[PDB]
Design a protein around this nucleic acid. Structure first.
Ligand code: MG
Ligand code: MG
Lengths: 1085, 266
DNA sequence: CAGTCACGACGTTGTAGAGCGA
DNA sequence: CTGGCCGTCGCTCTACAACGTCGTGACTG
């Protein structure tokens, strides 16, 4: 007896490395309370809870944490007679594993399944729940991956007489292979057949014969695609078995409800015997895809569990204020907060606190939880780090949460745990996901990898969603510390324990450890709230369903694979095959036009016309595709120019795209079908229940995201299926449309009579002064129209009429120009930078310093005050309008208009406040993102890299790539000027940059010259446009507002006083100053 | 009419220019302070004090309503209110005006310029017109009382005194007057003398009668008095005070002057 | 009186951040 | 009887730092 496949997680253990802080030994003398015990101990791991004690690994009648598991090692713990009928089940995740018939000998599988893995085979495991809440694994047999090769080419290269020859060639090529890994691979591991297909690129491409080659394993396929015949192009070799499973079966989804049913010859899904289970499921089945069907109409998410977790660590080395390192054995995980939620109800079900050492939670925290109706925290106590981590990994295995969240779990909390478990202890992680062994359980940091967009985690049956990743993609904050995000998003001020406070709290006995506990739990509850606000699983599952990829790939694998998989589905049913590129400079093509703005402060109404989904619509309107493009003029000679094809010059080359009635574009088909689907969904959101409306909203957003990605997909140099001819054509046409819109507007409505001839409703919009309608700005797909001589009040509607008129004048029917908004005032500063107020009253800020993350709170608030004056004070508005009456240089030589005194007042107040000694240093924190690994920078002398290396020197928490590094700029004292030459005059910003925590602690003074210069800079940049767009004039005129002060250095003043010099100015009555001059002139004489 | 008015034109502007020509862009950075008595320019060169008074007598028309006013010469840290008098920068001048406006705590000066135009029709150089606000809370220390002793030197004599001082703090110098009018300076080396009166080595002055000795570690004199391009000039000692100091003035209404702080040797 | 070594400020380029627009 | 990566686009401003040059400025025979 025993499980068919060995379980690799720990079901038992009786020796382990005991590591524990010596400070937990309360009766020890202080001579012996430093550092950690570290030695091997021959006990079973224990856990303590409420005065009780258990083995961490025993499964039984008791238990300190919940379980949703049937097997444990080989023992079946289900109640006798447990045998649930499964009809419908929800799938949230899909695994693909290779099984071998020989390994499955003693599992009693029906011959149907054994055949499919006879030499070997790939098994798709659907992971899911029943509506009664049982965990399900359905093992689907019979999905093979395949790739294509052109028959003519391989027959020439290999001299194949038949499809069987090709299989012999392929087996041979794998047999004589380095590493010798394909031992005993045979021609019968392959099937090849001849099919007719077309390569998707170009309209001229003729259909041809290809060998389709079925392969039973991903390892094989990936090797053949790298190594078989590099000269011979391959098609679809990169497609995985899951994709094949999803696409080969109509309507099947990677996330959603399924039913089991009778298959081809009335075959049925076989229940696996518990000893043959691959996973920690309650029930498992063997089936083929014909035993499966989508259970349409079934809607709601089943009772999946979410674990929200957070670890806290303590350093153990000689320096206890150093940030803990994980690879250092003595830098221990001391607590793990673990919150278990039901995703279907949002209910918190369990609060579990793992603690190394005893830990009495404060009664105040227990009462707050009790008040909020939250379950009483179970506190689990451990004598050593290993027993605590083992217990946590055990809970993860036995409770098996389908979703895991936390905050910065991918960069910190998970890596630190896996480092301990794999480096210090030697625990194999491959059994700790859903599979019982051999599953993926892995973190990838960005590291040196030039390509990699984000850090990733894959745990085979466990969807990890990091709220740090979600939040930075949906809210713009200068800082993304959890407590800043809590204040910003949840509107909760919350205290947050410093890592430097933890050691003292730890060594201060159990109650203090309880305080660490309180913090850890409060953290995890905030993260719970964030999760249930944004409902990231609903967004992600919506995209997963639409794109036909699993939820995990939806989160970590990029944008391309989403379009690629949808394009693959459509290409298949059209008879096209997609080629694989072999192997692995600023821009590949010209992008959008941005018109030169008429820079200035506009107080006449400005209408904004903007094209809706411009690039998608262009792709549909002009039938753009791989399969519709030709480079050769020869290719379209049988067609009629104008009515059969577009001829267009792009990147200095003549391109042809045939129109839809010659061949319909695949990209066009995708976009049309999606946009139809989206309009259909949004038509139902009104007449829906609030619960259903949330889901529909998530669905329509998913469609929008996927439609938007299509243009980018074509533009990726070295991507999956690039076509820079399409990408360049899209932007070329867009450029032509933006200019066409401008030409039309200028010609047609140059005179008010002409506007009235089109729109009678304009007749009672006419304002005083001369009529003109001119385009002052435009960017990509928006155009801004200054409408002198019309009132803002009517403009919205007349502009919607004009937008619709321009539409049917100029552009083919998917293309649609819309009138989004009217500004009543607009400061058009520069390309991609403007501030304006919409006719309803709302301020819109674009591009400028006020909305950029980098700049500090002080400068932003002051800037927002100056802007709120220019737009929402009548007096200043008029004065700013009046600057424009004269050339900007004249304002250097005349008094600045009376109304702009208030704007002056704000700068004066900011100057006064910046040099306040009781300022709060948080107002002065600047930030920047580490875009890349610090040794991938060319210009090494940057403020954030300066702080990065200072943090690392100080063994502080080193920032991750993509984190925002906060800094302040410190006063250039002689002591600072020292430290710099102590690293081998006016120093660069980079040199005067410093960690704000350090700056607070050591009482380092801020550089007021920097921050005030930077204020006047932000002001100057924004309000250039009041003064002829001239920065030197603006800097001068703004600087004239500040009260200048002159007095000599105090030493000199003192010395002069001792030499009988008299005073003029302050410190004296004015008459004394007059008196003193009358002595001065005659003594100077 | 402006509440306060100042004009230089014709010979008067020829005068002020004649006065400024030797200044050589030294004073262009400065405090400028204004009252009923006239205009006063103040700056520090190598730490030591420098001044140019301009009494109301040198101005073609004048006024002064309001408290003393004070400006910095540099306009927007680039141009300056004294740039006009760097005589080769505008050979063409015919009039310059100052006017002031605004109430007494927060005034603004405006400066306007007119030039020859192939004829004396005085076209305005409108683009060059300058504006500068008053210093809100300035504090400046200025000379007081009377010099205790005065001595009068020609261009040969004053330059030879600059030769008679050492060049730096490593070469301190002592100025003296011995009984019966033996004015002197020496630096261990570079000893010189002039014979005082109340031909080459004779010096004229007032209160020349009193004997004294004062020593100076300051480097400044060799540099400052050279780069104000002194011609003939007066020593004007303030010998009496706990710290004594020496005002070295030039000659003519270009009475640019610099005051040198000395050793308080009792 | 002019050939001259030297100095603080200016314009220019590249990088990097970070947003804008699809 | 065991192995792999990764994988939207281009435009634009602005700050910052590095690099070269420019007008000034006291200067010597
Ligand atoms: Mg954390
Ligand atoms: Mg749009």
């Amino acid at each position: 007896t025993g499980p068919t496949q060995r379980h690799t997680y720990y079901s038992e253990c009786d020796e382990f490395r005991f590591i524990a802080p010596r400070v937990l030994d309360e009766d020890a003398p202080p001579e012996k309370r430093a550092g950690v015990h570290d030695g091997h101990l021959k006990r079973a791991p224990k856990v303590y809870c409420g005065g009780d004690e258990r083995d961490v690994l025993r499964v039984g009648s008791g238990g300190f944490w919940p379980r949703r598991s049937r097997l444990w090692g080989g023992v079946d713990h289900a109640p006798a007679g447990f045998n649930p009928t499964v009809t419908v089940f929800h799938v949230y995740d899909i695994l693909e594993n290779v099984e071998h018939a020989y390994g499955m000998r003693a599992a009693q599988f029906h011959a149907r399944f054994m055949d499919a893995i006879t030499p070997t085979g790939t098994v798709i495991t659907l992971l899911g729940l029943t509506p009664e809440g049982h965990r399900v694994a359905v093992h689907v047999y019979g999905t093979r991956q395949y790739f294509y090769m052109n028959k003519e080419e391989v027959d020439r290269h290999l001299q194949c007489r038949a499809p069987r020859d090709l299989c012999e060639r392929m087996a041979a090529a794998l047999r004589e292979s380095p590493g010798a890994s394909f031992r005993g691979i045979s021609a019968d591991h392959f099937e090849a057949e001849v099919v007719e297909r077309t390569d998707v690129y170009y309209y001229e491409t003729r259909p041809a014969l290809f060998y389709r080659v079925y392969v039973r394993s991903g390892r094989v396929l990936s090797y053949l695609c790298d190594n078989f015949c590099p000269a011979i192009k391959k098609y679809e070799g990169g497609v995985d078995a899951t994709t094949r499973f999803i696409l080969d079966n109509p309507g099947f989804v990677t996330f959603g409800w399924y039913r089991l049913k009778p298959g081809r010859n009335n075959t049925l899904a076989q229940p696996r015997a518990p000893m043959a289970f691959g996973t920690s499921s309650d029930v498992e089945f063997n089936c083929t895809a014909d035993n499966l069907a989508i259970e349409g109409g079934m809607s709601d998410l089943p009772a999946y569990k979410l674990m929200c977790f957070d670890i806290e660590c303590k350093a153990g080395g000689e320096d206890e204020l150093a940030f803990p390192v994980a690879g250092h054995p003595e830098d221990l995980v001391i607590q793990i907060s673990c919150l278990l939620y039901d995703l279907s109800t949002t209910a918190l079900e369990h609060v579990l606190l793992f603690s190394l050492g005893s830990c009495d939670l404060p009664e105040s925290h227990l009462n707050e939880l009790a008040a909020r109706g939250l379950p009483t925290p179970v506190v689990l106590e451990f004598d050593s780090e290993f027993e605590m981590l083992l217990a946590f990994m055990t809970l993860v295995k036995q409770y098996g949460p389908e979703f895991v969240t936390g905050y910065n779990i991918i960069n910190f909390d998970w890596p630190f745990l896996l480092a301990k478990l794999t480096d210090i202890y030697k625990v194999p992680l491959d059994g700790y996901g859903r599979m019982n062994g051999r599953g993926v359980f892995r973190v990838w940091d960005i590291g040196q990898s030039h390509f990699q967009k984000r850090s990733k985690i894959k745990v085979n049956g466990m969807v990890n969603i990091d709220m740090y990743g979600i939040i930075t993609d949906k809210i713009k904050l200068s800082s993304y510390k959890l407590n800043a995000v809590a204040e910003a998003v949840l509107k909760d001020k919350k205290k947050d324990l410093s890592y430097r406070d933890i050691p003292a709290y730890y060594a201060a006995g159990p109650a203090q450890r309880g305080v660490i506990g309180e913090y850890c739990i409060q953290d995890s509850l905030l993260v719970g709230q964030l999760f249930f606000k944004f409902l990231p699983h609903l967004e992600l599952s919506a995209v997963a369903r639409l794109a036909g990829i699993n939820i995990t790939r939806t989160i970590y694998d990029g944008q391309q694979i989403r379009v690629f998989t949808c394009l693959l589905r459509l290409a298949d049913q059209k008879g096209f095959i997609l080629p694989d590129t072999q192997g692995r400079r600023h821009v590949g093509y010209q992008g959008a036009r941005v018109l030169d703005p008429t820079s200035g402060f506009h107080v006449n109404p400005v209408v904004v016309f903007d094209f809706a989904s411009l690039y998608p619509s262009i792709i549909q309107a002009h039938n753009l595709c791989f399969s519709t493009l030709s480079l050769r003029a020869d290719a379209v000679a049988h067609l009629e120019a104008g009515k059969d094809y577009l001829e267009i010059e792009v990147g200095g080359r003549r391109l042809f795209f045939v129109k839809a009635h010659v061949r319909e574009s695949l990209l066009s088909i995708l976009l049309r079908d999606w946009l139809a689907m989206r309009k259909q969904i949004r038509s139902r959101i009104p007449q829906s229940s609030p619960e259903e409306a949330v889901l529909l909203d998530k669905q329509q957003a998913a469609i929008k995201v996927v439609c938007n990605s299509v243009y980018g997909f074509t533009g990726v140099q070295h991507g999956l299926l690039p076509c820079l001819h399409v990408a360049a054509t899209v932007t070329t046409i867009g450029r032509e449309m933006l200019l066409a819109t401008r030409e039309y507007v200028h010609a047609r409505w140059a005179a008010f009579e002409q506007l009235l001839a089109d729109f009678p409703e304009a007749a009672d919009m006419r304002a005083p002064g001369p009529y003109s309608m001119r385009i002052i700005y435009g960017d990509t797909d928006s155009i801004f129209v200054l409408c002198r001589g019309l009132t803002a009040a009517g403009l919205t509607a007349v502009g919607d009429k004009m937008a619709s008129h321009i539409s049917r004048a100029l552009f083919l029917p998917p293309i649609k120009l819309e009138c989004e908004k009217t500004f009543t005032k607009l400061l058009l500063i520069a390309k991609k930078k403007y501030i304006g107020v919409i006719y309803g009253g709302k301020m819109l800020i674009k591009g400028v310093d006020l909305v950029r993350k980098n700049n500090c709170a002080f400068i932003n608030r002051t800037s927002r005050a100056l802007v709120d004056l220019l737009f929402y004070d009548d007096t200043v508005s008029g004065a700013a309008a009046a600057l424009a009456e004269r050339p900007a240089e004249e304002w250097l030589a005349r008094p600045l208009p009376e109304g702009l005194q208030a704007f002056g007042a704000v700068l004066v107040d900011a100057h006064r406040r910046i040099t306040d000694p009781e300022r709060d240093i948080q107002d002065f924190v600047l930030t920047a993102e580490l875009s890349r690994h610090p040794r991938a920078y060319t210009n090494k002398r940057l403020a954030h890299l300066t702080v990065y290396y200072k943090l690392m020197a100080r063994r502080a928490q080193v920032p991750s790539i993509k984190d925002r590094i906060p800094y302040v700029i410190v006063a250039q004292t002689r002591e600072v000027e020292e430290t710099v030459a102590r690293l081998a005059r006016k120093l660069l910003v980079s040199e005067l940059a410093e960690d704000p925590a350090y700056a607070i602690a050591h009482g380092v003074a801020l550089n007021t010259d920097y921050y005030f210069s930077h204020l006047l800079g932000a002001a100057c940049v924004t309000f250039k446009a009041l003064f002829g767009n001239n920065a030197k004039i603006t800097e001068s005129l703004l600087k004239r507002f500040i009260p200048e002060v002159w007095h000599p250095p105090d030493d000199v003043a003192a010395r002069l006083r001792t030499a009988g010099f008299g005073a003029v100015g302050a410190g004296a009555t004015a008459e004394e100053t007059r008196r003193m001059l009358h002595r001065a002139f005659d003594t100077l004489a | 009419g402006a509440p306060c008015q100042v004009v230089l034109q014709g010979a008067e502007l020829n005068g002020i220019l004649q006065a400024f020509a030797p200044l050589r862009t030294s004073l262009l950075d400065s405090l400028l302070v204004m009252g009923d008595r006239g205009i006063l320019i103040h700056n520090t060169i190598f730490g030591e004090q420098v001044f140019l008074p301009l009494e109301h007598s040198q101005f073609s028309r004048y006024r002064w309503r309001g408290p003393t006013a004070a400006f910095l010469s540099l306009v927007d840290q680039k141009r300056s209110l004294l740039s006009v008098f760097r005589a080769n920068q505008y050979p063409d001048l015919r009039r310059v005006e100052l006017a002031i406006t605004g109430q007494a705590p927060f005034r603004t000066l405006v400066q306007r310029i007119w030039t020859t135009t192939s004829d004396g029709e005085a076209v305005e150089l409108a683009s060059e017109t300058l504006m500068k606000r008053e210093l809100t809370s300035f504090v400046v220390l200025v000379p007081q009382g009377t010099p205790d002793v005065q001595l009068r030197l020609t261009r040969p004599q004053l330059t030879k005194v600059l030769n008679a001082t050492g060049a730096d703090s490593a070469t301190p110098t002592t100025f003296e007057l011995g009984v019966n009018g033996k004015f002197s300076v020496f630096t261990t080396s570079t000893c010189v003398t002039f014979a005082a009166r109340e031909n080459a080595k004779t010096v004229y002055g007032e209160n020349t009668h009193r004997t004294f000795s004062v020593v100076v570690d300051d480097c400044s004199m060799r540099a400052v008095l050279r780069r104000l391009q002194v011609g003939g000039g007066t020593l004007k000692f303030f010998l009496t005070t706990p710290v004594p100091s020496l005002c070295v003035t030039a000659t003519g209404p270009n009475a640019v002057s610099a005051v040198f702080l000395l050793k308080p040797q009792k």
